[PDB]
Design a protein around this ligand. Sequence first.
Ligand SMILES: Cc1sc(NC(=O)C2=C(C(=O)O)CCCC2)c(-c2nc(C3CC3)no2)c1C
Length: 130
Amino acid sequence: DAFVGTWKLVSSENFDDYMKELGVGFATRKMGGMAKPNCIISVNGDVITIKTESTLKNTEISFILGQEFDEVTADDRKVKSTITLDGGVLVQVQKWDGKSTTIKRKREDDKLVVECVMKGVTCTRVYERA
Ligand SMILES: Cc1sc(NC(=O)C2=C(C(=O)O)CCCC2)c(-c2nc(C3CC3)no2)c1C
């Protein structure tokens, strides 16, 4: 849709702090910090696929809106994830061990803007079309 395409990370703010608040150890935060992933979003029928591709780590999720799914995150958390569409924003929550984090994906001008929240920490990542 508005989201479909191949997107390249161009800017990131507060990602290390976000990873820290998730309990991500130094080695994984080092891998993630200066990573510049591609994000490849596609849809077929009910099913949306979001692939994240980077030199040291790839991940992928496929989901139906509103339907919880199991996810292994890039930092090896086993989480229960639900993604919904709310006012044009893809809202993802991950729940594990009585905690939650939210990842919101929205389109703004030429940007795919990804807001990641854990407790008091807010990180913002911006992608543009590859
Ligand atoms: C090479 C890469 S990329 C990447 N994470 C992203 O790109 C992420 C997002 C996005 O921009 O889609 C949005 C949500 C957070 C993550 C990691 C990594 N995340 C984590 C914890 C924070 C989940 N630990 O490592 C690494 C090692």
